[PDB]
DNA sequence: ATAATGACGCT
DNA sequence: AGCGTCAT
């Protein structure tokens with residue numbers, strides 16, 4: 277009762293760029309704007325595998341992982357841009373640099389956690405505090421929230437999207453407890469005002485559109501972000517959670533998209549996140565373990581405590597290439613030459629990293645996959661990273677895997693290698 | 707025959 | 718240390 281802790285302590289946003297790789301290519305090539313288009317890599321195999329799809333092309337059913345030859349059958353006017361290739365592999369530099377543009381702008385507003393190349397969580401608790409003080413006690417106008425959705429509103433006794441959005445925003449703002457700087461709903465509202473400002477800044481200064489979720493934790497902010505894509509932001513209040521989760525499939529919640537989520541569904545005999553509330557914490561801990569049990573108990577009530585970590589820089593820098601099917605590497609010099617390609621890209625990226633960020637990696641991780649073997653990595657081995665020298669790194673990486681070579685013949689490699697992966701890790705102040 | 711990456715848990 | 722899960 278007077279002591280129940282309701283997970284309303286923070287204001288957290290998740291900002292995610294809309295069809296990001298497509299937007300980067302579309303800013304550079306105006307002929308691609310506002311058309312169905314996709315970004316692909318490796319043109320030689322069925323037109324390339326699609327890794328990003330504009331919303332106009334999604335309306336025809338084009339999805340990521342589709343072959344471009346197959347996507348053209350769904351969308352004959354689909355326009356393509358292809359990832360740069362360097363040293364015989366995909367080169368994502370252009371998108372990393374675009375990502376840096378966005379991240380630096382978000383960093384001006386608050387502490388951000390870089391979560392992927394195109395999204396970052398934002399901890400707005402302090403910033404909300406400040407703006408509440410600066411704003412006398414004056415109402416929050418709907419004009420401050422021109423792209424915001426209030427999830428679950430409108431309710432109670434218009435046929436177009438923007439009309440619904442406004443009605444719900446009006447209902448929310450009409451109900452707001454403005455003379456109450458402690459109310460979690462007021463805090464989220466002010467957080468949403470700031471995220472409008474952050475997204476306007478991103479669009480003005482980069483040309484890129486994005487969406488955002490605003491809620492009290494990372495999981496809800498990420499869920500909310502996807503509710504009204506593209507180019508829109510969604511506020512998910514604590515109060516919206518029971519109805520939102522009542523028909524929310526379990527797999528849609530961050531970290532439940534895989535085997536854990538599948539076992540939650542099968543073991544408990546449930547479909548929706550809200551049905552989790554019927555189980556005691558001990559019961560959930562008995563099926564899924566102490567931390568997963570506790571996490572599920574709180575999460576299905578809308579409560580989650582994972583912090584927004586102050587980290588804008590990756591912890592690792594890695595290069596990898598697949599060699600599927602008959603292209604699997606089978607001679608030792610083939611293995612050596614690719615390791616050298618990977619090491620040369622890694623040297624470039626590390627040197628830049630050291631200049632910009634004043635740190636050095638100190639460990640090199642070599643990972644390979646074998647023909648027939650099932651998993652992402654078949655095998656990982658590590659060694660010291662003492663010099664950003666591509667030839668040393670590729671030689672060292674070879675040294676530590678070369679006795680994986682089951683092959684008798686002096687010049688062959690068996691089993692064939694279907695993946696090579698070099699990763700620099702364990703950064704330290706430089 | 708998606709691919710290329712990245713964060714982190716378990717042991 | 719080396720492996721497994723989950724994600725974009």
Ligand SMILES: Cc1cn([C@H]2C[C@H](O)[C@@H](COP(=O)(O)NP(=O)(O)OP(=O)(O)O)O2)c(=O)[nH]c1=O
Nearest residue numbers: 292293294295296297298327328329394505725
């Ligand atoms: C999912 C996914 C995305 N990406 C690259 C390009 C995507 O544009 C960049 C950002 O990912 P996202 O936010 O999951 N997808 P999106 O930005 O293209 O589209 P949306 O507007 O966010 O739904 O992901 C991959 O390279 N492999 C992937 O598996």
Ligand SMILES: [Mg+2]
Nearest residue numbers: 292293294394
């Ligand atoms: Mg995105």
Ligand SMILES: [Mg+2]
Nearest residue numbers: 292392394395
């Ligand atoms: Mg994303």
